[PDB]
Design a protein around this motif. Sequence first.
Motif, short mmCIF file in Angstrom:
data_model
loop_
_atom_site.label_atom_id
_atom_site.label_comp_id
_atom_site.label_asym_id
_atom_site.label_seq_id
_atom_site.Cartn_x
_atom_site.Cartn_y
_atom_site.Cartn_z
N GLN A 184 125.24 46.48 75.84
CA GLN A 184 126.04 47.35 76.71
C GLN A 184 127.27 46.64 77.27
O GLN A 184 127.98 47.20 78.12
N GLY A 185 127.53 45.42 76.82
CA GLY A 185 128.70 44.66 77.26
C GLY A 185 128.50 43.81 78.50
O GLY A 185 129.44 43.15 78.95
N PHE A 186 127.29 43.84 79.05
CA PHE A 186 126.97 43.17 80.31
C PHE A 186 126.14 41.91 80.09
O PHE A 186 125.59 41.68 79.01
N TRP A 187 126.05 41.10 81.14
CA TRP A 187 125.08 40.01 81.18
C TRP A 187 123.74 40.62 81.58
O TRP A 187 123.31 40.57 82.75
N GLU A 188 123.10 41.26 80.60
CA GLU A 188 121.90 42.05 80.83
C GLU A 188 120.67 41.23 80.47
O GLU A 188 120.63 40.63 79.40
N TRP A 189 119.69 41.23 81.36
CA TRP A 189 118.51 40.39 81.20
C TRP A 189 117.29 41.11 81.76
O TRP A 189 117.42 42.20 82.30
N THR A 190 116.11 40.53 81.60
CA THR A 190 114.88 41.14 82.09
C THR A 190 114.16 40.19 83.05
O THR A 190 113.65 39.14 82.66
N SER A 191 114.14 40.58 84.32
CA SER A 191 113.37 39.88 85.33
C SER A 191 111.89 40.13 85.08
O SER A 191 111.49 41.21 84.61
N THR A 192 111.07 39.13 85.38
CA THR A 192 109.63 39.18 85.14
C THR A 192 108.81 39.73 86.31
O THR A 192 107.58 39.85 86.20
N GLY A 193 109.47 40.08 87.42
CA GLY A 193 108.78 40.75 88.50
C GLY A 193 109.30 40.43 89.88
O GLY A 193 110.41 39.90 90.02
N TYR A 194 108.50 40.71 90.91
CA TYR A 194 108.99 40.55 92.27
C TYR A 194 107.86 40.36 93.26
O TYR A 194 106.71 40.67 92.99
N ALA A 195 108.22 39.84 94.43
CA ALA A 195 107.31 39.82 95.57
C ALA A 195 108.10 40.17 96.81
O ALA A 195 109.32 39.94 96.88
N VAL A 196 107.39 40.74 97.78
CA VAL A 196 107.96 41.09 99.09
C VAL A 196 107.39 40.14 100.13
O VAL A 196 106.17 40.07 100.31
N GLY A 197 108.24 39.40 100.82
CA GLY A 197 107.74 38.46 101.81
C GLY A 197 106.72 37.51 101.22
O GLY A 197 106.91 36.97 100.12
N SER A 198 105.62 37.31 101.94
CA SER A 198 104.59 36.40 101.47
C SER A 198 103.54 37.11 100.62
O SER A 198 102.46 36.57 100.37
N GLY A 199 103.86 38.32 100.17
CA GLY A 199 102.94 39.09 99.36
C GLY A 199 102.76 38.55 97.95
O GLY A 199 103.50 37.67 97.48
N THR A 200 101.77 39.09 97.25
CA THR A 200 101.48 38.67 95.89
C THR A 200 102.58 39.12 94.94
O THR A 200 103.19 40.17 95.10
N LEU A 254 125.44 44.37 96.56
CA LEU A 254 124.02 44.48 96.88
C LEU A 254 123.12 44.33 95.67
O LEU A 254 123.58 44.18 94.54
N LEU A 255 121.82 44.36 95.94
CA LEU A 255 120.77 44.31 94.92
C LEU A 255 120.20 45.71 94.73
O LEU A 255 119.62 46.28 95.65
N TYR A 256 120.37 46.25 93.52
CA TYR A 256 119.96 47.62 93.20
C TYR A 256 118.81 47.58 92.22
O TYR A 256 118.97 47.10 91.09
N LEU A 257 117.65 48.08 92.65
CA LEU A 257 116.42 47.97 91.85
C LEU A 257 115.70 49.31 91.79
O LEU A 257 116.08 50.24 92.50
N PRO A 258 114.66 49.43 90.94
CA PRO A 258 113.98 50.73 90.85
C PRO A 258 113.40 51.19 92.17
O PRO A 258 113.05 50.37 93.03
N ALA A 259 113.31 52.50 92.33
CA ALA A 259 112.91 53.09 93.60
C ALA A 259 111.54 52.61 94.04
O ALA A 259 111.28 52.47 95.24
N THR A 260 110.65 52.38 93.08
CA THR A 260 109.31 51.89 93.41
C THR A 260 109.39 50.53 94.13
O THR A 260 108.71 50.28 95.12
N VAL A 261 110.20 49.64 93.57
CA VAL A 261 110.34 48.28 94.09
C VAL A 261 110.95 48.30 95.48
O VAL A 261 110.51 47.60 96.40
N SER A 310 111.16 50.82 97.63
CA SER A 310 110.23 51.41 98.59
C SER A 310 109.20 50.38 99.06
O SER A 310 108.87 50.31 100.26
N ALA A 311 108.68 49.58 98.13
CA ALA A 311 107.68 48.58 98.49
C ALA A 311 108.27 47.54 99.44
O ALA A 311 107.58 47.05 100.32
#
Length: 330
Positions: free
Chosen positions: A192-208, A224-231, A233-234
Amino acid sequence: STGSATTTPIDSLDDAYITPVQIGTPAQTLNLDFDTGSSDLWVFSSETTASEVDGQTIYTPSKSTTAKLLSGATWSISYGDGSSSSGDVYTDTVSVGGLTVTGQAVESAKKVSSSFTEDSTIDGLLGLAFSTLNTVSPTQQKTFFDNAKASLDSPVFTADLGYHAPGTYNFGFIDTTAYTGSITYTAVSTKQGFWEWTSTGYAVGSGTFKSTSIDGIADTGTTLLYLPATVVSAYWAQVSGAKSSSSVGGYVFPCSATLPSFTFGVGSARIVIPGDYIDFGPISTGSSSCFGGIQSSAGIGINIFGDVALKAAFVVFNGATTPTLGFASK
């Protein structure tokens, strides 16, 4: 060859970063927004509609002995935030942090949208995405990085953005003193012409840590950081009183809150965004409602690792034949 230039936040919120760029002979120094999410180098100029210029420094090609009209060439670009600009094209000598490209396409704005006029601190953009996104017609032009590539000691540039502080863009070398630990590299898609990559996941605060693939772009030109609505919201569920506001245009939170960190995965490595990085202050002067630095990508069509994420890391943009992205803590 190499180059090294300091990049400086435009305001107290780190809304964007400007980097001095020398254009023409004698040099005309303009402060440009280095944007790994686009591929045009365009400037405010002597050709820009006068009512659309408000405090910016302009490029005047007629005062440059090395400027040449690229006859017939025009450009027109629209950005994800709805802003836009258009004009014609010169070739000229362009230097960043001591690194010089001759024959660089310098896109001279005839028109810019309100957002650009209203930002006195940004004199133009320097695109660092792949040249396939460049908008010059009928002959697409190369980015500064693509033109410099063959002369560079190594075909890389690095972004080291500061939190409420200056940082550095380097070209052609990796400063091993600028990060801690090791750099973790991850695959890039250029489809798509971008520096496009796949992050392996996330954590919120000290969560798993949640292992999940998040496709997105590394974009220094997005605040800003724009991520899926599920992420998202969490994340905001962990902030008392936070809510998504349709009137404001995203998640807001009580300015009295302490924000948790946000971790994203790069392969088996982890980059931690401190909570303070996610605070973008009152929505309006004097308000006790603060704007969040993590927002939903729903309806953008792509996830965007913007400055909020990138400034937590030392980031290597590897433009070898097979491109990759590297992230280190710092």
